[PDB]
Design a protein around this motif. Structure first.
Motif, PDB file in Angstrom:
ATOM      1  N   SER A 100       0.838  -1.193   0.000  1.00 22.34           N
ATOM      2  CA  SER A 100       0.000   0.000   0.000  1.00 22.34           C
ATOM      3  C   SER A 100       0.875   1.245   0.000  1.00 22.34           C
ATOM      4  O   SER A 100       1.297   1.719  -1.058  1.00 22.34           O
ATOM      5  CB  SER A 100      -0.944   0.006   1.204  1.00 22.34           C
ATOM      6  OG  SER A 100      -1.428   1.311   1.466  1.00 22.34           O
ATOM      7  N   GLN A 101       1.130   1.781   1.194  1.00 26.85           N
ATOM      8  CA  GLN A 101       2.081   2.873   1.399  1.00 26.85           C
ATOM      9  C   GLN A 101       1.655   4.146   0.674  1.00 26.85           C
ATOM     10  O   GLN A 101       2.457   5.064   0.490  1.00 26.85           O
ATOM     11  CB  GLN A 101       3.494   2.468   0.971  1.00 26.85           C
ATOM     12  CG  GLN A 101       4.590   3.030   1.862  1.00 26.85           C
ATOM     13  CD  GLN A 101       5.968   2.878   1.256  1.00 26.85           C
ATOM     14  OE1 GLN A 101       6.147   2.176   0.265  1.00 26.85           O
ATOM     15  NE2 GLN A 101       6.956   3.530   1.858  1.00 26.85           N
ATOM     16  N   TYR A 102       0.391   4.210   0.258  1.00 28.36           N
ATOM     17  CA  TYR A 102      -0.189   5.411  -0.341  1.00 28.36           C
ATOM     18  C   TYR A 102       0.584   5.839  -1.590  1.00 28.36           C
ATOM     19  O   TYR A 102       1.217   6.893  -1.637  1.00 28.36           O
ATOM     20  CB  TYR A 102      -0.223   6.549   0.681  1.00 28.36           C
ATOM     21  CG  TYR A 102      -0.935   6.206   1.960  1.00 28.36           C
ATOM     22  CD1 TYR A 102      -2.315   6.086   1.998  1.00 28.36           C
ATOM     23  CD2 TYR A 102      -0.226   6.005   3.134  1.00 28.36           C
ATOM     24  CE1 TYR A 102      -2.970   5.778   3.169  1.00 28.36           C
ATOM     25  CE2 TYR A 102      -0.870   5.697   4.310  1.00 28.36           C
ATOM     26  CZ  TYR A 102      -2.243   5.583   4.323  1.00 28.36           C
ATOM     27  OH  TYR A 102      -2.894   5.273   5.493  1.00 28.36           O
ATOM     28  N   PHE A 103       0.524   4.978  -2.605  1.00 25.53           N
ATOM     29  CA  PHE A 103       1.300   5.209  -3.817  1.00 25.53           C
ATOM     30  C   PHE A 103       0.950   6.541  -4.471  1.00 25.53           C
ATOM     31  O   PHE A 103      -0.219   6.918  -4.573  1.00 25.53           O
ATOM     32  CB  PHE A 103       1.085   4.085  -4.824  1.00 25.53           C
ATOM     33  CG  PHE A 103       1.888   4.258  -6.076  1.00 25.53           C
ATOM     34  CD1 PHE A 103       3.247   3.994  -6.082  1.00 25.53           C
ATOM     35  CD2 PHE A 103       1.295   4.722  -7.236  1.00 25.53           C
ATOM     36  CE1 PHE A 103       3.994   4.169  -7.228  1.00 25.53           C
ATOM     37  CE2 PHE A 103       2.036   4.899  -8.387  1.00 25.53           C
ATOM     38  CZ  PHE A 103       3.387   4.621  -8.382  1.00 25.53           C
ATOM     39  N   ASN A 104       1.983   7.242  -4.936  1.00 28.80           N
ATOM     40  CA  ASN A 104       1.835   8.516  -5.620  1.00 28.80           C
ATOM     41  C   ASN A 104       2.542   8.462  -6.967  1.00 28.80           C
ATOM     42  O   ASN A 104       3.571   7.799  -7.120  1.00 28.80           O
ATOM     43  CB  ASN A 104       2.396   9.671  -4.785  1.00 28.80           C
ATOM     44  CG  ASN A 104       2.257  11.011  -5.478  1.00 28.80           C
ATOM     45  OD1 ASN A 104       1.371  11.204  -6.310  1.00 28.80           O
ATOM     46  ND2 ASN A 104       3.136  11.945  -5.138  1.00 28.80           N
ATOM     47  N   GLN A 105       1.971   9.167  -7.945  1.00 29.19           N
ATOM     48  CA  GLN A 105       2.567   9.198  -9.275  1.00 29.19           C
ATOM     49  C   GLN A 105       3.921   9.894  -9.263  1.00 29.19           C
ATOM     50  O   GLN A 105       4.845   9.472  -9.965  1.00 29.19           O
ATOM     51  CB  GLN A 105       1.621   9.882 -10.259  1.00 29.19           C
ATOM     52  CG  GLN A 105       2.253  10.152 -11.608  1.00 29.19           C
ATOM     53  CD  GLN A 105       2.785   8.889 -12.255  1.00 29.19           C
ATOM     54  OE1 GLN A 105       3.867   8.887 -12.835  1.00 29.19           O
ATOM     55  NE2 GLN A 105       2.020   7.807 -12.161  1.00 29.19           N
TER      56      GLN A 105
END
Lengths: 771, 233, 99
Positions: A100-105
């Protein structure tokens, strides 16, 4: 203005709005118009919460629509061709990309940019970098990078300007990079790296600096590609200084307690050779370590050239600033687990509040590294708020596995298999108290042993230990048998050990043993006289027993890097470990060693071996035991013929030929050692030759034998196998390697002056070392 | 995800339980993320992370344990389970080291590191200041007193070994910090005694007598009033 | 713990060190920071009677005093009042010798 009353945050998916309000810098009953909007929007943008959140004022129930930021629950990797899957996996997870880890572009973009730069840093430019994104379940997403590398990046041409001082052939020989060739096809030696390029750059520039050309002004470098961006060409132009002469470098500044006369003495510069860059670096290192050996870690030197053409000399004035005498405030210790703390404190100097000198600090480095309990140790200096004269010197430790079992097997050429056993232990999970079990066994011998010691019985530290042994020798074996009998040795002993200086350290030990020498059916006169002089015979056999009050005195020191890769330095030492007086057989035997190493080349080197000693005794017994004789001729002697094959080959029952040898030990080694550079710098392969000198004598001539003379002349003296300082000419090759699984023995022997009474062995092989 | 079989939450919990009972971990840990993805609004994330931390403590590493636990700390700082977390934090930095090869019934614990017990002290301090009525705090208090005792013993041993080398000057500051910041510890009498030894060895009569008055006011009864201090063993 | 054996090998012990020109620079009657910068950090400092700043020396052997030199200094209400010790005189002829 509006007051907060239970903000109805809607549009959420898995945000647990309770923890949202907890994450909200405001709670119910808080007045708000616009102050916290940016703060909250940036707070949620941080930690990868959302991407579009809107806030309005509506009857206390503010509709905070939120869109969950994508979270990569599952990650995948591919395209790993040059590197393995594990390598790319760790170097990507080093930048987040966890569950998960709050993926960001933007994280995607920075990661792909970094990896692309890493790959282009090496010899890979025409690379297809195409990551793919797959939309997994509500929040989970997948990414997989696809990497399609080019053919390769090869350097075709190397060229230069200003090459009027030295031929491009010789210089290109000097520079440590390759071009197209047949023997260079191995290991892709023509690839390019920016780092290695720069390394060769400073190397060659320094080379010129030693060549007398001042400051060797490098103009500029350029790299030019080819068709398809495949082949590359390098061109750098520089500007040399011309030939010169330096003979008048001067120093200046303050010294405080330091003597300027000592400074002049340590100044090792002369007009000869007109310069040397590394000599200048070395003298700087010497002066700096001196300037701080007194306790000034921040005294600084300033350099400046003063040019003068025509005479072609540029004076160098070296201005030193000393200041702020430094002591140490406290010592912290890291890596202290599984062990004590004083144990490492036992060795270093500068207990506290001491003049910080590297002089004894590097001594501490050496002292702790020779302990070998850790692979890496670092010494760290840091001051505190109370800056003056006081700095922390906490040091690093790297705990290394040591408590295991010594179950190791090997193979020997003559006997065959051999095994070793016993738990390896030097540290009872704390202080040293080094005690362990060690035993070996073969078809010809066995020996158990337990060791127990403290290296520091005293404040300075004395090593006291018990050690047991049970070694028994069974020379009787298959056809390749030396004189057949048995040996029965066992018992314990106490080892004491004291250093006399930082570089010298002796060790003694007294004990008492017992032996039961035994014979067989009719043996040569050298056995009959011995047994009828002390022993007792029964039938065609016999034996003898005696006490073995023994004393041992020893000393040594090492000076080479070694670690299976010998380097500059040599071994020094002397020993005497036999049954000393106090019991029968009043004997004395010396010991020596020299391991001179000459690392004067990149690969070729030579080692000189040194040994001197006499095993002869004195007292009531004026003779030398057969079992105390040397095994002249063979590996440990000369690496030449088969083991223990020097001296008179006597006739006996069945008319065999077994020699004795003397009690003189003296050897001279000279072999051209070198690795193999084809594969890489792996510490795995060597190669050399075999050319040794070995002398051994008894004094007694042998003329009467078992009804037959084994010598060419009836009057052959047995004191020496040949003229004074006896030796046999012989020299061959030696294929060395380092470690298939560790131990080895491989070499080809070629003798010289083949006598009609000696036997040779061209090749020998041993495994798992010995003893 | 070898099978990705659909199951119920309690079945997965029991499977994880027996996996701990059977020392099986990779499937136990790997079913946690798949159940959480299948069951987002579930409390099983907390038990999953805590049991993974316990297993990692049973293993060599703790980095992913701490990653997950402060991840949760950022997630739901109101689920009262954090008391265990910090506690196991103090446990994971404690390193009880349950192994048969190194039983060592003595086990002074006086060797791990200053960082471990510093962090333990601060963690349990935050615990007690926020949860004085915790599910358990006597163990916390025992842990802090044991660690501070180990610290004091460490420093006292350093001083006495310095005395074996007669490092009087260093031991001076050793003692000063011992009394300065290591109050109500059993390792005080010998500290001041070796202090007296240092000053008398350094020919400091007035200050030695001043410390004599200090000790007698504090410790009127002690064998070392008439016994010049000596090193043990 | 007894019967030291004849080991002709010992660690090199130090007591303390101070630079004589600082002694030449010692004027009475200035504050703690002034004398601090004048000399530097004292190796030790008590608290209950914290105007006693003195240095020492020893080229000891197995812990025995071999050489020593001391200069205690006293202070009141943050100013130098006096100082005394055995190192001042020898520092004085040392300074005269090298200057």
């Amino acid at each position: 203005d509006f007051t907060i009353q239970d903000i109805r945050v809607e549009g959420l998916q898995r945000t647990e709005p309770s923890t949202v309000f907890n994450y909200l810098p405001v709670k119910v009953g808080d007045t708000y118009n616009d102050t916290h909007g940016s703060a909250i929007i940036k707070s949620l943008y941080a930690t990868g919460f959302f991407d579009d959140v809107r806030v309005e004022t509506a009857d206390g129930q503010l509709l905070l629509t939120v869109i969950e930021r994508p979270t990569i629950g599952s990650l995948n990797i591919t395209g790993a061709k040059m590197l393995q899957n594990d390598a790319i996996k760790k170097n990507l997870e080093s930048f987040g990309l966890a569950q998960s880890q709050y993926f960001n572009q933007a994280t995607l973009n920075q990661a792909v940019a970094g990896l692309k730069e890493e790959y282009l840093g090496r010899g890979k430019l025409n690379i297809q970098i195409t990551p793919k994104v797959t939309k997994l379940a509500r929040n989970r997403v997948d990414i997989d990078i696809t990497i399609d590398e080019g053919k390769s990046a090869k350097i075709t041409d190397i060229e230069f300007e200003g090459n009027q001082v030295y031929s491009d052939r010789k210089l290109m020989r000097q520079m440590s990079l390759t071009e197209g060739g047949i023997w260079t096809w191995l290991t892709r030696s023509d690839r390019f790296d920016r780092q290695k390029f720069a390394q060769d750059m400073e190397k060659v520039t320094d080379f010129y600096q030693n060549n007398g050309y001042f400051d060797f002004r490098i103009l500029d470098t350029d790299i030019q590609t080819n068709e398809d961006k495949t082949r590359q060409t390098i061109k750098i132009t520089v500007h040399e200084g011309g030939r010169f002469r330096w003979g008048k470098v001067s120093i200046e500044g303050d010294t405080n307690e330091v003597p300027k006369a000592e400074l002049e003495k340590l100044l090792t510069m002369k007009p000869g050779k007109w310069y040397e860059r590394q000599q200048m670096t070395a003298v700087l290192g010497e002066i700096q370590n001196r300037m701080g050996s007194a306790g000034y870690a921040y005294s600084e030197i300033s350099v400046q050239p003063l040019p003068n053409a025509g005479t072609k000399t540029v004076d160098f004035v070296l201005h030193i600033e000393p200041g702020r005498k430094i002591y140490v405030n406290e010592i912290h210790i890291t890596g202290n687990n599984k062990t004590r703390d004083e144990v490492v404190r036992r060795e270093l100097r500068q207990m506290e509040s001491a003049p910080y000198d590297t002089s004894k600090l590097q001594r501490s480095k050496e002292r702790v590294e020779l302990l070998g309990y850790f692979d890496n140790v670092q010494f760290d200096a840091v001051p505190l708020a109370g800056t003056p004269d006081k700095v922390d010197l906490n040091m690093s430790l790297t705990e290394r596995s040591t408590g295991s079992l010594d179950l190791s097997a090997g193979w020997v050429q003559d006997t065959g298999l051999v095994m070793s056993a016993g738990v390896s232990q030097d540290n009872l999970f704390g202080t040293g108290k080094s005690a362990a079990l060690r035993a070996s066994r073969s078809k010809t011998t066995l020996n158990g042993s337990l060791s127990f010691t403290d290296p520091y019985f005293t404040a300075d530290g004395v090593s006291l230990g018990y050690d047991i042994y049970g070694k028994a020798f069974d020379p009787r074996k298959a056809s390749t048998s030396v004189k057949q009998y048995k040996t029965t040795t066992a018992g314990g002993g106490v080892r004491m050990g004291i250093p006399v200086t930082e570089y010298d350290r002796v060790n003694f030990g007294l004990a008492a043993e017992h032996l039961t020498v035994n014979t067989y059916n009719k043996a040569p006169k050298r056995y009959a006289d011995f047994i009828r002089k002390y022993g007792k015979t029964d039938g065609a056999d016999g034996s003898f027993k005696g006490l073995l009050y023994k004393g041992t005195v020893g000393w040594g020191r090492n000076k080479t890097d070694s670690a299976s890769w010998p380097t500059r330095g040599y071994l020094t030492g002397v020993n005497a470990e036999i049954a000393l007086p106090g019991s029968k057989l009043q004997y004395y035997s010396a010991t020596h060693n020299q391991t001179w190493f000459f690392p004067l080349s990149k690969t070729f080197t030579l080692m000189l071996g040194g040994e001197v000693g006499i095993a002869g005794g004195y007292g009531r017994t004026k003779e030398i035991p057969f079992f105390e004789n040397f095994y002249g001729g063979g590996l440990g002697s000369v690496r030449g013929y088969e083991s223990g094959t020097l001296g008179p080959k006597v006739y006996d029952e069945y008319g065999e030929k077994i020699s004795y040898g003397g009690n003189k030990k003296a050897n001279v080694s000279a072999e051209l050692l070198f690795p193999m550079p084809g594969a890489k710098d792996a510490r795995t392969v060597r190669l050399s030759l075999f050319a040794d000198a070995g002398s051994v004598w008894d004094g007694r001539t042998y003329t009467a034998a078992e009804n037959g003379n084994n010598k060419s002349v009836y009057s052959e003296n047995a004191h020496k196998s040949t003229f004074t300082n006896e030796l046999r000419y012989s020299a061959g090759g030696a294929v060395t390697w380092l470690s298939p699984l560790g131990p080895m023995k491989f070499s080809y022997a070629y003798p010289l002056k083949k006598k009609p009474e000696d036997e040779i062995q061209r090749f020998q092989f041993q495994l798992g070392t010995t003893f | 995800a070898q099978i990705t079989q659909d199951w119920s939450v309690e079945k997965l919990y029991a499977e994880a339980q027996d996996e701990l009972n059977s020392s099986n971990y990779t499937r136990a840990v790997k079913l946690y993320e798949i159940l959480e993805s299948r069951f987002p609004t579930s409390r099983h994330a907390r038990q999953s992370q805590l049991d993974t931390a316990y297993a990692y403590y049973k293993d060599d590493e703790k980095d992913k344990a701490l990653a997950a636990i402060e991840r949760f700390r950022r997630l739901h700082p109101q689920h009262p389970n954090m008391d265990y977390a910090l506690y196991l934090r103090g446990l994971v930095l404690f390193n009880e080291d349950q192994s048969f090869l190194n039983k060592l019934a003595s086990q002074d614990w006086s060797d791990r590191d200053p960082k471990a017990n510093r962090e333990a002290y601060q963690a349990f301090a935050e615990l007690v200041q926020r949860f004085p009525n915790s599910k358990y705090a006597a163990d916390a208090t025992a842990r802090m007193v044991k660690l501070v005792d180990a610290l004091g013993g460490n420093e006292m041993s350093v001083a006495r070994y310095y005395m074996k080398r007669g490092a009087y000057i260093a031991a001076a500051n050793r003692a000063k910090k011992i009394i300065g910041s290591y109050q109500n510890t059993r390792y005080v009498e010998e500290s001041l005694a070796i202090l007296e030894l240092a000053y008398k060895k350094l020919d400091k009569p007035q200050l030695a007598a001043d410390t004599r008055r200090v000790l007698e006011t504090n410790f009127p009864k002690s064998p070392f009033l008439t016994h010049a201090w000596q090193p043990d063993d | 713990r007894v019967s030291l054996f004849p080991s002709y090998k010992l660690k090199i012990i130090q007591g303390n060190e101070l630079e004589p020109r600082a002694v030449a620079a010692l004027r009475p009657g200035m504050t703690k920071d002034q004398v601090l910068l004048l000399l530097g950090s004292p190796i030790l400092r008590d608290a209950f009677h914290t105007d006693r700043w003195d240095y020492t020396f020893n080229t000891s052997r197995n812990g025995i005093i071999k050489e020593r030199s001391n200069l205690t200094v006293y202070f009141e209400n943050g100013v130098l009042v006096r100082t005394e010790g055995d190192a001042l005189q020898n520092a004085a002829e040392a300074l005269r010798a090298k200057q």
